[PDB]
Amino acid sequence: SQLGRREIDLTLLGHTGLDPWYGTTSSARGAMFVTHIGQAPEVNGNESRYFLTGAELEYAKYTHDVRFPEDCRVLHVLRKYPTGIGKDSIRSNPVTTIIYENYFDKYKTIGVLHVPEYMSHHQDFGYELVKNREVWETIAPNEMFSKDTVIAQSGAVKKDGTLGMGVNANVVFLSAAGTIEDGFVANKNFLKRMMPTSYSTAVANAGRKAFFLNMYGDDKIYKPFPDIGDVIRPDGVIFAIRDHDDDLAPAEMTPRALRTLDRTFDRAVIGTPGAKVIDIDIWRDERVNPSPTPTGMDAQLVKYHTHLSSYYRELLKIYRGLLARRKDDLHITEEFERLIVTAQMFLPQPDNVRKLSRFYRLDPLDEWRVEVTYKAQKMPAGAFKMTDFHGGKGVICKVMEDEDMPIDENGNRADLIIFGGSTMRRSNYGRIYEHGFGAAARDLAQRLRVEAGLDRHAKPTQQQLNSVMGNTQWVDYAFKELLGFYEIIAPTMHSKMMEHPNPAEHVKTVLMDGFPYIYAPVDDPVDLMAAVNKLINSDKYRPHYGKVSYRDQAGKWVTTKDNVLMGPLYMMLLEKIGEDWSAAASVKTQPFGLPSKLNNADRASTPGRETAIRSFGESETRSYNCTVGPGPTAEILDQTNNPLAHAAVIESWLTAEKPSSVPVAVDREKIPFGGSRPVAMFDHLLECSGIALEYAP
Amino acid sequence: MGLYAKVVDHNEVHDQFTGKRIYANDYNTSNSDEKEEFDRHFYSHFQDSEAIESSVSCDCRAIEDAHKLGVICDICNTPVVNTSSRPIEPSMWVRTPKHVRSLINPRLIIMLTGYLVTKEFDFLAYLTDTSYRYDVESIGSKETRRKVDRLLHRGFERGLNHFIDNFNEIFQFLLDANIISNNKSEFAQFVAQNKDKLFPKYLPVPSKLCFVAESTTSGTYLDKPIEAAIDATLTFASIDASSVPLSPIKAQNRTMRGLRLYGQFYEIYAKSRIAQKPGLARRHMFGARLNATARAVITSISDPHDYDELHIPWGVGCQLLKYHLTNKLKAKFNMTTREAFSFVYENVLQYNQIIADLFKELIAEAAPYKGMGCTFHRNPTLQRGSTQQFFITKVKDDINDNSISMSVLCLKAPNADFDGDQLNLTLMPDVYLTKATERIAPHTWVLSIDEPHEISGNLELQGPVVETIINWAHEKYLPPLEEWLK
Amino acid sequence: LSEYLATLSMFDIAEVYNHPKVREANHNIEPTTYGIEKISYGKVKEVFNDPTQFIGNSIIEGLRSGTQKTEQLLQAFAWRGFPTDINSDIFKYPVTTGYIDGIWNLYENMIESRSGTKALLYNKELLRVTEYFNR
Amino acid sequence: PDPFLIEKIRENTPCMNPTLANGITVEHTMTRDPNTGVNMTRRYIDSLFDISSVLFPDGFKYEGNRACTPLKHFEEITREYNAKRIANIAPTDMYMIDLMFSYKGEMLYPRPMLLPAFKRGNMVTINGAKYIGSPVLTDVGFSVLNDSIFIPFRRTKLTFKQTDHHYMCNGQRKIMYVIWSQIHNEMARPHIESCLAHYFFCQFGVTQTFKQWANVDVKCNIYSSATEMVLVIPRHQESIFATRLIAGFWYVVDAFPMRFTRPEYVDSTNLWRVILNIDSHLHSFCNSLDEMTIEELKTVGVNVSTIWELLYEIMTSLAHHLYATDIDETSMYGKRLTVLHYLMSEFNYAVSMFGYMFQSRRDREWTVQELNEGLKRSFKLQTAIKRLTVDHGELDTMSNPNSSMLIKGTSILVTQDRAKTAKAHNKSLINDSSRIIHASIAEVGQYKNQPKNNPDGRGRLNMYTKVGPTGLVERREEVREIIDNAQLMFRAK
Amino acid sequence: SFLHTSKTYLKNYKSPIEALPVFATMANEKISLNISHCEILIYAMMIRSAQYRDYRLPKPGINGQFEKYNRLMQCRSLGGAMAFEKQHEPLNNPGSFLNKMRNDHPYDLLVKGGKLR
DNA sequence: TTCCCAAAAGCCTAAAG
DNA sequence: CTTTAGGCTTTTGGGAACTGTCTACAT
RNA sequence: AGACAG
Ligand SMILES: [Zn+2]
C-alpha cells in the first residue's frame, strides 16, 4: 500500500528536516520541537547526532563566526590590553582587531574585523569562539587570505561537516517515581557533560555621585573589581559603590569600612560566583578639573583606561595615515567608520573644543563607567529544562550518582530515565524509533568490540586498532555485518556503503567511535515497523533486551523484573533554566507606599531577583475571599498595602523568641484597619468628588 | 447589609481639617515666587529618574532626617511625616469668590452633565453662565431642539447666583417636561434628601500624590487627566489674579468654568485611572505585589513524604527567611544586625552549615506544624486547588537546585506539570493567617464539588505510579483458581 | 514496588503492531467517516478490549486501566482521521497513515500541521474570552 | 563519523540558498555594485529622489549623495546644541551619508543622514540593542482580499470594494455590481459610498466619460432608475463597462435626487463635485500616481499610465478579482520579499512630504536661504531611524542562544499587518480566509514550524526557496508538480 | 447570553421553576454540570421586586423576577460593582445614594481598608 | 481589529384638554 | 385639533485571561 | 504593546 514510499523532500520542510521520523510525531510535538531548537543554548560537550540527515550539514555551514567578507590583504593587527609581564600587565587578551584591504577592486575598500574570545546574542547565554590554528597563526600584516575564510568558529561546529546541538544520552524508559508527570531522572556525569556557558556584563557608574569600594584588594592594594582572567569572590559581588559624603569621612572611608560591604545603603552588582572575568571596558571623562574620585582608588581604572586609550589612539592613527595617503580615495567599510567614530568618542577632545557629554540611552555618564564581562559554566541539577529533539520537554526532577543509575548486563549505564507512557499520550513515536534503532546500532558496534578482542565502553588505542586491522578476514566480516545492518535500516546508506573505497577505514572508524553513525534521510524508502520487526526477528542486530538493575530511593540495589531496553536519545538543553527565582522578604517601596517593579540597575544588585510577586490578583483574591472569610484576605492585603502593617510584621519577626509561629503578626488594636494606601487614595479621591462609600445603617 | 454611596458635606470636611489651611484663590501666579509655591503645593515633583533617599521628609525636601518626626518645618509650616505613610489629604482648598453665592458640588455637576450636556446644546452651561454662544437654527436634532425651545420659552435668568438660589424651581422644571426624561424618581428623591450637601462653600483640591510630574532628560512627564484639574484650579486663580476686578457676571462665569473643569476632571479620572483594566480599583484595591513572596520553577520530590510538605531551596530560603535568619543570628551569636544582613546576603549564593542549622531550627520551632506555613499559587487561578496551603520543611543544601518540592499528590489540583513552569509562594507571617489558610489546605478539594458522594478526580495517582501498580498487581504470577486448588 | 516498573521500547509497539487483526483493520478501508471511524476503529477497539490478546504489554495494560486514553492509541495504530483546518472544517480526503507508521505524504502532513495550528489558536484566544466570562 | 559517510551525505543533499541563508536583508540593503561602489540603500535613495524630481522648480537639481568621513560623522553626531556637546556612547551600528542638491550650478549645504548598516545574518545594533531585520512578504502590484482590491501608493493605501445595485432595463429589474472606494479620509437619505463611476462623473462630464471610455452614447435599450432621467444606449453597442457605469450612476442618483432638478446639469462637473468641493483633494487624486506603482502594475500584467487608466482597468479588467478571483489570498507565490520599502518608510514619507509642501507653497523664485531652511526642516540626521525601533515591526529583538542564524535569526518573515505593528491589533487569525491551508507554505514558509507569532506556516521562511533578482519569489518546477496535486486536495469538496 | 422569531434568554422566563430545566439541558448537552450549580447560578440571576428598584436576592426564592447582569452588578452592592467594569456608572448614579436594603458582597470589606463597621 | 451588548438618540403613532 | 407620552429601530461606546522575564524612549 | 515561559 506504498507504506515504504515517501513523496517528500528535505526541501519542503527546513527545521523539521533536522530530524528523521518527523511523520511519526504529532504536529504539536513537531512545532514544539522546532521551538526548542530555537530556544536551545550551546553545551560545552557537543556531539554529532547518531542519526544523520543532510540538513545538519547546511546548518553547520551557515553559523556565526568571524569571516573575511572578501578577498582581502591584512594591513594591521591590533590587540587591546597587551599581554606580557610588567607593572600594568594583562593576563588575557579579549579582542583582536584586523584592519584589512579588499583588493581586486577599483576602490580597495578598507574594512575592520573583530575577533573576540566569545560571541553572545541571548540576554544571558553565549558560546566561546575557537580560533582556527592554521589561520590564526598566519594572521599578520601584509598577508594573503581568501573569501569566506573562517576564524573563531563556534564549538558546536565539528572538525568534519556536522553541527553539534545536543548530547547523546543512554535513555531508559522506566515508569519510575522520579519521572512523575513530565520529568527526567539524570545522573551527575551526564549533567556534567551538559554545562551551558553564560556570558554576562555588569555595568557600574562612579563619579561625583559615588565611589567604588575595595572588594578584591587587601589593605595595601586597592582593587574595586576583578582583573581580566580573575575569579569573582565566593559571594559574587562587584563594584559595591558607596555614596560620596565628606562629613562621613571617618566612618565610611576608613580602610576597614571600604572593604566592609553594607548590604543596605551601598550599590553592588552581584553575578555568578566563581565566574572568570572575560574583559573590562572603561569609559572616563578626563576633562573635569576636580576629580570626584579621591586619590588612591583609581589604579585599575586608570590602567585599563590607558590600555583602551592606546588601542583607540592607534586605530585613529591608522585611519589618519590611510587618509593622508589616499585622500578622496579612502572608501571604507561602514563598520570601520563606526569604529573610528567610537574611538573619537572615547579619546579626549582638544582644549579648543567643548568636551563630550557622554550618554548611554538618555542616561548621563559621570567620570568612571565600568563594563565587566564574565563567563560562567552552569551546572544543571534541577529546574533545568531539557528536550529530546522531539515534542518531549521536561525538567530534571531527580539527580543521582553514576553508580545509582540503571545498568544493563552489558554494562551500559543509563544517562536519563523517562516515563514511557507520555509517548503514548503526546504521540511522538519517532523518539522510540531512534531509541530502539540506536540501541541496536550501539549493540552492533559493541558486538564488534567483543569480537575484535577489545573492550566495550572504552575507546581503543591506535595500537589496538592497528592490531585488529592486521587480518583482512575479520575486517571484511565486520564490514559485511555493517552493510547488512545499514540495509535493514537505511537502504540509501546501504548503497552508499556498497560504493565504498576502503571498508577497512569504515570498520576502524566504527570501532573507534563505538557507534555506527547512520545517515537516515527525510526521503528514506523505509517501512519503519518492518525494519523494527526485522531487527527483532533476527539472531544478530538484535538489541540486548534483558533485565536492568538500578538503585531505588531506599538505597537498595534492585533488579527490574521485566526486560528493559536502553537506547541513545539525542538530548538538548533549553533556556528558562531557572536563575530567575525572586524571593523577597521585604521590597523597596515607592514614595506612594506600594511595592514597585525592579529597574535594571536595581534589579542586577541582589543575589537572585528580589521582585514582589503579584500572587494576589483578582482571581486569587476571589478564591481567597470565597474559600476563607474576607477578613484574613483583607488582613493580608492590608499588610502588603499599608507600609506600617508590613513594618509591624517585620518587627514581630525580629522581636520574637520564635520567629516562626508568631501568635499575632499585627496587633490590630495598635494598627487599625483602613490604613492601606490604595483604599485611602480611593476614599480621598471620592471625597474630593463629594461622595464616600459607607456601610448601610 | 450592603454598601451604598453617601454625599459628603465639604463644609464639614473643611471645618474638621484643623491644620494648615491654604487656599488656591490666593495664588496670583504670573510670577516666579507664587508659581513655584503653587508647584510645591501641587505637582508632586520627581526631579531625576533616581531612587530617593528621604524615608521621612516634610513637604519641602530639606528635612531629610527621620528622627525629627512631627516637627513643624518653619519653611512650610507642615509637620514631618513618613513619605510612604504620608496622610492622603486634599492639597488645597477653594472658597467662593467675593461675588459668588456658593459653589456647586462636583458630584451634582457630574450627575447633571449626563443629561443637561448634549452634543447639540449645553443646557447646564446656558442655565449657569452668561458667556455661552449658541445658534438655535444650528441644532441638527429634533428632541434637543424642542428642549431648547421649551427652556427658552420658560425664561430663567442665566446667572450662577440665580441658579443656586432658585435651584429648587429650576430643578423641578428640568424634571417636568423632557430635559432628563429618565430616572426622574431616584434623581428627584436624591435632590430632595441631600439638598443642603449639594452647594458647599468650600471645595477641596485633591492631594499632592494625586498629581505626579517626573522631570527627566527630554522634559517632564505628566498625565492627561491631571491637565483638566490643573485648569480648574488655575481658573479660580484667575478669579483673583486680575488687574481689573471682574464684574459679578464675569466672576460667576469664571467660577462656573472652573467647576465644569473640576467635573470633567473627576469624570475622566474615574473613567480612566480607576475603571480601566490597569488602574486603582481593579489593580491595587484587590491585591497587588505582596511582600515575603517568592516565585520559582516547581521541581518536586519523588520520595516517601507528606502531601503538606514543601522544600524551599537555599537562595529562596535565605532571601525569603531573611529576618528569621537575622533574628536567629542575633539571638544565638553576638552579631550586630548589620553583620547579620552581611552574613545572610553573602551566603545566599554559597552554602554553609550555620544557616542550614538555622533553617532546621526555625522549622523545628514551628512546633504544631510540619514546617513554616505558606500558600502556593499556580496561574491561572481556576479551581480551589490552584491555591493551596503547604508547610516548608527544608531548604535544599544544593545551591544549584532552584527548585520547589511540592507534593506529587497535590499536582493535579492545579494544572501543574514539570515542563518548566514557575509557581508562586507566599510566606504566612502569623499563626492566625496559618489557621485561616487551613481552609485552603489540600484536604479541602478531596471531595468533588460536582458530585454528591465521590472523591474528586484530582486525587487520582499519577502515571508512573499507576503503571507500576498495574505491572505488579495485574501479573500472571499464580495459576488460575481451579488449577491452584487442584 | 521498586522492581515492578513499566517499560516502553520498540518491542511493545511491534507487539501491538504485528497483531494480525490490527493489520487487517489497517488495510482495505474505504476513505469515509463510516468506513474509518466506525469500522476500522471498531476492529481496533475490539482487539484492545479483549482481556486475553495482550498480556504483559505495558501499553495495553495501561490502556485497560485508563492510563492512556483510547483516542491517541487509535490515531497511532489505526488510520488518522480527517484533521481540521484553522476554521473548524473537515478535509474531504482523510489521512491514510497513523502515527506508528509514518505520515510521509505532503497533504496529510500539512493538514495535521493545520490541526496543530488550530490547537494553538483555540488555546490562546478562546482562553482570552473564556476567562472573562468566568470572571 | 566516517569522513566518506559525511562526503556521501553532502553529495546526496540539496544545498540551501546563499541569498536567503546569509541574509536576504543583507543583499537588499548592503550590496555594492562592482562598476561603482554604492550600497543598495544609496541607490534606493537616488531612485526615490529621481522619482520626486518631477516636482522641482527648474534648477533645484538633486546631485546625489556621498559617504561621509568618520571625522565628519563624529563632528555631525556630536553638535554644540546650546553649549552641551552631547554624545550617545553606544555601539549603534550606523553609517552616515550626505545628500547634496545643486541650484543653477552652485552647491547648497549638504544634508547629512544616518543609515542602519546591516551586518551579515540580518543583524543590526541600534542604541546598544541587537536587532534582527526581517524581510516583509509583500504583494507585487496589488492584493486581493476577502472582498477587495487593495492597492498601495506612496501616499495612500487605497481599497477598492464593491456592492450590488438595481436598475431597470426595458422595464425589467436587473442587478449589477457597483465598485466603490473611499478616498477622502475625513469622510469617516440612505448612506452610500464613493463609487468609481462617481469619480468619473465628478472629473469628466457623463456624456464625455461615456464617449471617452466606451463606444456608448447617453440621452439624459433604455436604462432607468428602480424605486427620473433615461439613459438610452444603441441596441448593439453594449458592454459590461457601460453597464457598470450605469449601475454606479443610478447608485449615486437614486438616494440623493433632491439636487437633481434639470437632468442636463448631470452633464456638468460642479454639480457632481457638490454631490461628492475639495478641488485640492481632486487634484491630488488625479496626480496621485507615481513611477513605482506603474512599474509594479506593468510587472503584474496591467498597463496603467494614468490613474484614470487604472480606474478603467479595475472597472473592466481587474473587477474579475472582486467576485470570482483566479488567484487566491491564501497562497504566497508571486510575492516580493521587500526590505528597503519598509525600512525607509520614514525616509520615503519625509521625501514625499518635502516635495509636496515645497511645491504647494509657490511657483515663484526660490532663494538659497529658503531652500536651505526647507532642507534643514525636512532632511534631519535621524529622519529614517527615529522610528526604526518603535514604528517598524520587521525589526525584532534578538534573543538567540545559538551560533546558527538560520533557526531564529535569518528565517523570519513578517506579514504586512504584522510589519507595520503601529496598529497593535489582534485579528484573532481564525475567522480569516487569509490564513487557510495552502501548498505554497510547503515551498514558501515552514509548516510544522508554528510560533505564536503566526501559528500557521507563513511566520517563517523556507530556506530552499528559489528567489531571483529584485526579491521576487520564483517557483521551483519539480516539487511544483507534487505541490499542484496537494492544492487540489486542499480544495476538495 | 442565556445567563446574562424567538430566542431563549433567561429574563424571558416568568418563574425559575420553568427556567431551570432549559438551562440544565443546555449545559448538560456538552458539560456535565450538577443541578445544584445551575440552581445557584439562576438564583444569583434573580431579583425581588424589580419595579421597586430592589436588587437583593428574593426569598424564599420564587417570589421574584429575573434581571440582566449589568443592572444587578451596578445596582446590588457598590463594593461588588467596583470590581466590575464601568465603576463611574454606579458612582454617578442617584439610586446608589438611596438608603435601600442591599445585599452584602465580600469586596465590600476590600473596598474599605478592612473596617467591619 | 472585530464581535458583544447595553444605554442613549431618534422616530412614527396614539391619547387627553 | 394641538401637544406631548410609548415602544421599536439606529447609533455609539466601553470592553474583551492570569502570573513572570525581556525589549524598545531626547534632536 | 511586541515577543517568550506556563
Ligand atoms: Zn518644609
Q: What is the secondary structure of C56-90 as a DSSP string? A: S-HHHHHHHTTSS-HHHHHHHHS-----B-SSS-B
Q: What is the DSSP letter of A148?
A: T
Q: What is the DSSP letter of C39?
A: I
D380 CB neighbours strand G below 7 A:
yes
Q: Is E80 left (phi over 0), alpha (psi -120 to 50) or beta?
A: alpha
Query: Which residues of chain D between 419 and 438 are close to nucleic strand H, CB under 7 A?
Result: 421, 424-426
Q: Do chains D and E touch (3 or more CB pairs under 8 A)?
A: no
Q: Are strands A368-377 and A276-284 parallel, antiparallel or unpaired?
A: antiparallel
Q: What is the DSSP letter of C36?
A: I
d(CA A676, CA B287): 11
Q: For residue E117, which residues of chain A lie inside 8 Å, CB to CB?
A: 695
Burial C78-100 (b: 16+ CB within 10 A, else e): bbbbbbbbbeeeebeebbbbbbb
In the chain, the amino acid numbered A261 is L
D276 grid coordinates:
461628492
D339 grid coordinates:
526590505
In the chain, the amino acid numbered D109 is Y
Q: Nearest 5°: phi and psi at E42?
A: -65, -40
Q: What is the secondary structure of A453-500 as a DSSP string? A: T--TTSPPPHHHHHHHTT-HHHHHHHHHHHHHHHHHH-HHHHHHHHS-
d(CA A338, CA A340): 5
C116 grid coordinates:
496543530
The number of CA neighbours under 13 Å toward the Cβ of B202 is: 20
Spatial contact of A688 and B206, defined as CB atoms under 8 Å apart: yes
Resolved by:
cryo-EM
Ligand 1 centre to CA of B71 (Å) is 10
Measured from the Cβ of residue D361, the count of other Cβ atoms closer than 10 Å reads: 10
Q: Residue B266: which of A689, A691, E86 has the closest Cα? A: A689
D126 CB neighbours strand G below 7 A:
yes
Q: Are strands B44-46 and B212-216 parallel, antiparallel or unpaired?
A: parallel
Q: Residue A671: which of A641, A651, A648 has the closest Cα? A: A648
Helix/strand/coil for D427: coil
The β-bridge partners of A289 are none
Measured from the Cβ of residue A406, the count of other Cβ atoms closer than 10 Å reads: 25
Catalogue the long-range contacts made by C38-43 (C-beta closer than 8 Å, 24 or more residues apart): C40/C78, C40/C79, C41/C74, C41/C78, C41/C81
Q: Which strands sit side by side in the sheet containing A126-130, from one edge to the other?
A: A118-120, A126-130, A153-154
**Chain C interface test: which of D448, D489, D493 (most C C-beta within 10 Å):** D489
Cα angle A297, A301, A305 (rounded to 5 degrees) comes to: 150
Q: What is the secondary structure of A25-93 as a DSSP string? A: B-HHHHHHHHHHHHT---BSS-B--SEE-THHHHHHHS---EE--SS-EEEEEEESS-BSSSTT-BS--
d(CA A441, CA A455): 17
Containing H/E element for D244? Answer: helix D240-254
d(CA C25, CA C42): 9
Ligand 1 centre to CA of B39 (Å) is 14
In the chain, the amino acid numbered B334 is N
Q: Residue A600: which of B314, B403, D128 has the closest Cα? A: D128
Q: C91 CB contacts (<8 Å, ≥6 apart)?
A: C82, C83, C84, C85, C111, D489, D490, D492
The β-bridge partners of A78 are A97
Question: Is the C-alpha dihedral spanning A533, A539, A545, A547 positive or negative?
Answer: positive
d(CA B285, CA D429): 35
Q: Residue A424: which of C97, C12, B411, C25 has the closest Cα? A: C12
Cα angle A621, A622, A627 (rounded to 5 degrees) comes to: 100
- E strands along A401-453, which residues? 416-418
The number of CA neighbours under 13 Å toward the Cβ of B466 is: 21
Helix/strand/coil for B468: helix
Helix/strand/coil for A582: strand
Spatial contact of A665 and A635, defined as CB atoms under 8 Å apart: no
d(CA B89, CA B108): 22
For residue A491, whether the previous peptide bond is cis, meaning omega lies within 30 degrees of 0, is no
Chain H positions within 7 A of any protein Cβ atom are 1-6
d(CA A316, CA A319): 5
d(CA D117, CA D40): 11
D431 CB neighbours strand F below 7 A:
yes
Ligand 1 centre to CA of B54 (Å) is 13
- At what angle are helices A643-654 and A630-641 packed, to 10 degrees? 90
Spatial contact of B280 and E111, defined as CB atoms under 8 Å apart: no
d(CA B469, CA B485): 26
d(CA A506, CA A496): 12
Residue position matching grid coordinates 582587531: A97
In the chain, the amino acid numbered B386 is S
Instruction: Tell me the resolution in Å.
Output: 3.3
Name the residue in chain C with its Cα closest to that of D426: C125
Residue position matching grid coordinates 428602480: D226
Q: What string of H, E and C letters represents the secondary structure of A390-407? A: CCCEEEEEEEECCCCCCE
- At what angle are helices D240-254 and D307-316 packed, to 10 degrees? 100
Q: Are strands B78-79 and B72-73 parallel, antiparallel or unpaired?
A: antiparallel
Q: Residue D433: which of D148, D162, D135, D137 has the closest Cα? A: D148
Cα angle A493, A498, A503 (rounded to 5 degrees) comes to: 105
Q: What is the secondary structure of B246-309 as a DSSP string? A: PPHHHHHHHHHHHHHHHHHHHHHHHHHTTTSSSSSTTTTTT----SSEEEEE-----SS--TT-
Q: How far apart are the first and last CA of chain C?
A: 45
Q: Are strands B92-94 and B203-205 parallel, antiparallel or unpaired?
A: antiparallel
Max distance between CA atoms of chain A, in angstroms, equals 106
Q: Nearest 5°: phi and psi at D357?
A: -75, -10
d(CA A11, CA D462): 8
Question: Is the C-alpha dihedral spanning B43, B47, B50, B56 positive or negative?
Answer: negative
**CB pair distance less than 8 Å for E115 and A637:** no
Name the residue in chain C with its Cα closest to that of B473: C4
Helix/strand/coil for B28: coil
Q: What is the secondary structure of D428-473 as a DSSP string? A: -SSS-SSS---THHHHSS-TT---SSSSSTTSB--TT--B-GGGBB
Residue position matching grid coordinates 458635606: B9
For chain C, what percentages of helix, strand and coil (3-state, to nearest 5) are there?
55, 0, 45
In the chain, the amino acid numbered A225 is F
Spatial contact of D29 and D343, defined as CB atoms under 8 Å apart: yes
Q: What is the DSSP letter of D301?
A: T
The β-bridge partners of D224 are D168
Burial B338-370 (b: 16+ CB within 10 A, else e): eebbbbbbbbbbbeeeebbebbebbbebbeebb
Q: Nearest 5°: phi and psi at B406?
A: -70, 155
Q: Residue A156: which of C114, D372, D401 has the closest Cα? A: D401
Spatial contact of B91 and B208, defined as CB atoms under 8 Å apart: yes
In the chain, the amino acid numbered B459 is L
Cα angle A177, A179, A183 (rounded to 5 degrees) comes to: 155
A135 grid coordinates:
589561520
B421 CB neighbours strand H below 7 A:
yes
Q: What is the DSSP letter of D271?
A: H
A4 grid coordinates:
515504504
Q: Nearest 5°: phi and psi at A372?
A: -100, 115
Spatial contact of A308 and A79, defined as CB atoms under 8 Å apart: no
**CB pair distance less than 8 Å for A693 and E114:** no
In the chain, the amino acid numbered A485 is F
d(CA D41, CA D99): 13
In the chain, the amino acid numbered B292 is A
Spatial contact of C11 and A437, defined as CB atoms under 8 Å apart: no
Q: Is B167 left (phi over 0), alpha (psi -120 to 50) or beta?
A: alpha
Q: Nearest 5°: phi and psi at A236?
A: -60, 105
Interface residue B448 vs chain E (CB under 8 A): no
Cα angle B54, A588, A647 (rounded to 5 degrees) comes to: 85
d(CA B401, CA A396): 10
d(CA B450, CA E33): 7
B124 grid coordinates:
447646564
Which of E108, E111, E113 is opposite residue A673, by nearest beta carbon?
E113
Residue position matching grid coordinates 443541578: E35
Ligand 1 centre to CA of B57 (Å) is 8
Total H helices, total E strands in chain D? 20, 16
A218 grid coordinates:
587587601
What is each CA distance from B115 to A42, A425, B110, in whole angstroms? Answer: 67, 62, 10
Q: D426 CB contacts (<8 Å, ≥6 apart)?
A: none
d(CA C92, CA A371): 62
Spatial contact of D40 and D31, defined as CB atoms under 8 Å apart: yes
Measured from the Cβ of residue A255, the count of other Cβ atoms closer than 10 Å reads: 12
Spatial contact of D319 and D160, defined as CB atoms under 8 Å apart: no
- E strands along B324-386, which residues? 372-377
Name the residue in chain C with its Cα closest to that of B463: C67
D175 grid coordinates:
442587478
d(CA D289, CA D312): 14
Distance from CA of A34 to the nearest CA of E (A): 35
Nucleotide G15, nearest residue via CA and C1': E85
